Design an enzyme around this catalytic site. Structure first.
Site, PDB file in Angstrom:
ATOM      1  N   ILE A 143       3.752  -2.508  -9.134  1.00  0.00           N
ATOM      2  CA  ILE A 143       4.680  -1.499  -9.016  1.00  0.00           C
ATOM      3  C   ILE A 143       3.800  -0.270  -9.038  1.00  0.00           C
ATOM      4  CG2 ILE A 143       6.572  -0.135  -9.938  1.00  0.00           C
ATOM      5  CD1 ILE A 143       8.142  -2.947 -10.156  1.00  0.00           C
ATOM      6  N   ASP A 144       3.687   0.737  -8.006  1.00  0.00           N
ATOM      7  CA  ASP A 144       3.081   1.802  -8.203  1.00  0.00           C
ATOM      8  C   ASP A 144       3.872   2.981  -8.996  1.00  0.00           C
ATOM      9  OD1 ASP A 144       0.823   3.751  -8.120  1.00  0.00           O
ATOM     10  OD2 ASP A 144       1.184   3.980  -5.619  1.00  0.00           O
TER      11      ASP A 144
END
Lengths: 78, 738
Positions: free
Chosen positions: A37-38
């Site tokens: 997850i960025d």
């Protein structure tokens, strides 16, 4: 309980944003390490929570939250 | 809402048969669109401007044809032309004068020794003659006359060592139409393969693009037949630019409407919707958007104001009718052909893996930091504006065509020996309403020519004083030699039989269509007005016919029609947004974003074209590109805001990211298709059409990647209640349980 409801909401948002099933989403894991997850994805999660439900996570604070436990605790606090 | 689709889909087969039969009857009896445009064209010189009034009065008084078209012919060889070339030229001139239905008059100069110096080049290896054809420049009669002159030239056998081409402005527009018609098919093919290669990537099938090819070609043939019918019965007019832009923009808009349609179909398939439900959801979603955007592209074009030239009025009326036909073809044939064709399995397939996430993540950088990104996008737009101080335009068309054409090759041949703007003259008149055939009048007439000469870039004027054009001084002629046949041979080509209207043929320096060359027109008019002041010529109407003044008068309407389009198109966007959405201020924001991004589009297209490639932008690349950019950027922003409205129920900020995720892939595909189809004009033999297409394509890329991506949604986020105020705004939905 409230914990299960908030976790389910977060997992639904997870499924919407990046297409991982809520079934395997548990509060015993991180976001970037496991789910890939960025920082922008976490920002999207924060915006979705702010809109759909009544909660506010200010900027320069999502970085400090690493695990799902931290996020859920912060939401419960407010 | 379920009614118009229930009339289009249930009757799909009969209406498709009707479309086929009407296309057949419009193509077999009614000629093809190319021949219809050739038979029904519009003037390239004005009809309500001083320039046209000048030529009309000139024809009235000189009895040399009531039109303004003027072509030229060049005879160049490897050495100075001999007497054999003169004999061949005389035979050709006799044959040309034999024809009457095509050529109205002959402004022969090379034949007459007294003015042969004004035709032959400095080195003696070239010569030219000016003919006056029938009909206005770029009109059907003018094109027919140009073709007749070319056929006459090719019929005769050129002398050895000398070849013949056709030059001139009228010939230039005629050959421009020839090149447009010739390259129409190649542009069609290149666009069809471009759409194929992009659908192979966005849909993972080849037949899915074959059906789109069939739909696009059917729609193109339908609009071609409709425009052919309407222009065959003299109802409307057409032109080369109108025809080529109509055809290629029709292909691009039909394929983009199809992209929207079957992309919402793809989204429906991904969401589990069947064929019959995907059809109706596709309609209810994007059919109204397509209608609004087609009406915008039609209304803006049609409302290109009542300008001096048909290149605006009758470039927007037939374009508007063609766009109405294309949007009707979309809304009726597209749904029907879809319903009948995409009813077989293994023909459509969705590819949604790696494109829905990169448009939802970029959407998160618009709502949690609406400030920084908004100011960044506006800064990019202003950086595009930073080259406005150094913005330039060029009205020339020789630089915007390939050198292989006969007209452009004749220009190259002329430039090889001539070093002038000889092929594009300029004529000034002064109606004294009395006999101007006395010594004093001749003495004072050179004052106008000298005053015009004082302006920079008019270093030689082919006035009545001498066809040579060398500015020696104000000539004086004795009255005894005033009336002789030799002098009359030129006096009939300079002054009226009794004398009402004068003519001053003028040759500029360097490019005659440049900014300086067209700013020279105001100076010429002022000098003419001052010259007639305090002289018996006072009170005369200074009508300036030709090409430089033609472009000056036409460019005077650039601001007028741009403003009127930026009023009417934006008002139509207002209406569409108020009808299929609820806001009044946002109807102004959706156009404010586009007008701000117009600066960035202009900056990019002048950095790419002028700064790098060294070619400025044609004036048609200004008005047409800006209006089409307004319309299509409004289409994209309108789809975005329509999706936003469809997703406001879950929230404003979250609606932005939802709409971005749901629309980014389709909008990006459509923008790439439109941009590449427009950039296909680079091999169109019409580099002005190439500039229009490239500018529009780069602007659309900037819209689909920056403006629609971040600039519009950032504004929507920053001003929440002021974006849907009439419908009442609750930024968050009423708090919901977990």
């Amino acid at each position: 309980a409230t914990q299960e409801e908030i976790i389910a909401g977060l997992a639904e948002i997870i499924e919407e944003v990046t297409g991982i099933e809520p079934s395997e989403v548990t509060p015993e894991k991180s976001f970037v390490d496991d789910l890939d997850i960025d920082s922008l994805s976490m920002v999207e999660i924060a915006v979705q929570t702010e809109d759909k439900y009544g909660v506010k996570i200010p900027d320069e604070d999502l970085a400090g939250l690493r695990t799902v436990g931290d996020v859920v605790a912060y939401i419960q606090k407010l | 809402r379920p009614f118009i689709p229930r009339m289009i889909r249930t009757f799909a087969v009969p209406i498709i048969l009707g479309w086929l039969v009407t296309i057949a009857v419009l193509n077999v009896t009614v000629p093809q669109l190319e021949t219809v445009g050739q038979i029904q064209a519009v003037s390239m010189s004005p009809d309500a401007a001083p320039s046209m009034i000048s030529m009309k009065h000139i024809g009235k008084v000189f009895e040399e044809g009531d039109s303004d078209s003027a072509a030229m012919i060049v005879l160049e060889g490897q050495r100075p032309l001999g007497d054999a070339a003169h004999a061949f030229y005389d035979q050709m001139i006799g044959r040309l004068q034999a024809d009457t239905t095509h050529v109205q008059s002959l402004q022969d100069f090379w034949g007459d020794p007294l003015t042969a110096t004004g035709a032959q080049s400095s080195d003696g290896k070239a010569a030219y003659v000016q003919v006056k054809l029938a009909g206005n420049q770029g009109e059907s009669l003018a094109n027919e006359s140009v073709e007749a002159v070319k056929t006459i030239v090719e019929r005769l056998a050129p002398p050895p060592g000398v070849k013949v081409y056709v030059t001139g402005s009228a010939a230039l527009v005629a050959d421009q139409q020839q090149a447009g018609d010739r390259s129409l098919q190649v542009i069609e093919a290149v666009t069809f393969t471009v759409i194929i290669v992009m659908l192979l990537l966005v849909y993972r099938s080849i037949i899915t693009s074959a059906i789109m090819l069939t739909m696009v070609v059917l729609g193109l043939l339908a609009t071609r037949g409709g425009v052919a019918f309407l222009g065959f019965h003299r109802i409307i007019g057409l032109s080369t630019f109108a025809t080529n832009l109509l055809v290629v923009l029709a292909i691009a808009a039909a394929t983009d409407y199809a992209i929207f349609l079957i992309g919402r179909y793809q989204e429906a398939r991904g969401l589990g919707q069947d064929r019959e439900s995907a059809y109706y959801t596709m309609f209810g979603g994007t059919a109204h958007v397509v209608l609004g955007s087609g009406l915008t592209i039609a209304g803006a074009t049609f409302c290109l104001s009542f300008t001096r030239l048909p290149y605006f009025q009758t470039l927007g009326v037939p374009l508007a009718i063609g766009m109405v036909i294309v949007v009707a073809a979309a809304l009726t044939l597209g749904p029907a052909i879809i319903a009948v064709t995409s009813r077989f399995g293994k023909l459509l397939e969705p590819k949604r893996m790696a494109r829905v996430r990169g448009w939802r993540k970029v959407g998160a950088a618009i709502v949690r930091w609406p400030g920084p990104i908004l100011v960044g996008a506006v800064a990019l737009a202003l950086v595009g504006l930073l080259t406005l101080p150094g913005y330039r335009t060029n009205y020339n068309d020789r630089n915007y065509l390939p050198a292989d054409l006969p007209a452009n090759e004749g220009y190259a041949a002329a430039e090889r020996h001539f070093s002038q703007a000889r092929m594009n003259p300029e004529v000034l008149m002064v109606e004294s309403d009395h006999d101007m055939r006395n010594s004093a009048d001749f003495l004072v007439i050179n004052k106008i020519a000298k005053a015009i000469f004082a302006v920079e870039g008019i270093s030689r004027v082919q006035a009545i004083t001498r066809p040579d054009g060398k500015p020696i001084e104000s000539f004086y002629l004795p009255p005894e030699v005033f009336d002789n046949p030799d002098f009359q041979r030129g006096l009939e080509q300079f002054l009226s039989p009794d004398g009402h209207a004068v003519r001053f043929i003028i040759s500029h320096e360097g490019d005659p269509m440049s900014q300086a060359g067209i700013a020279r027109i105001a100076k010429i008019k002022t000098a003419a007005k001052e010259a007639i002041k305090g002289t018996p010529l006072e009170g005369s109407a200074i009508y300036l016919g030709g090409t430089a003044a033609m472009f000056k008068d036409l460019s005077d309407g650039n601001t007028y029609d741009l403003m009127i389009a930026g009023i009417s198109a934006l008002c139509l966007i207002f209406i569409i947004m108020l009808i299929t959405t609820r806001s009044v201020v946002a109807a102004a924001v959706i156009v404010g974003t586009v007008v701000l991004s117009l600066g960035a589009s202009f900056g990019l297209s002048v950095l790419i074209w002028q700064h790098i490639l060294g070619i400025e932008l044609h004036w048609l690349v200004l008005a047409m590109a800006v209006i089409i950019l307004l319309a299509v950027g409004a289409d994209y922003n309108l789809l975005l805001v329509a999706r936003l409205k469809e997703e406001i129920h879950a929230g404003i900020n979250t609606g932005i990211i939802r709409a971005m995720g749901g629309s980014g892939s389709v909008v990006t595909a459509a923008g790439l298709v439109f941009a590449f189809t427009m950039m296909s004009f680079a091999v169109s033999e019409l580099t002005v059409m190439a500039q229009v297409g490239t500018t529009i394509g780069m602007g659309l890329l900037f819209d689909t990647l920056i403006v629609r991506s971040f600039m519009t949604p950032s504004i929507a986020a920053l001003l929440g209640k002021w974006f849907w105020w009439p419908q009442v705004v609750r930024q968050r939905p009423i708090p919901q349980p977990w």
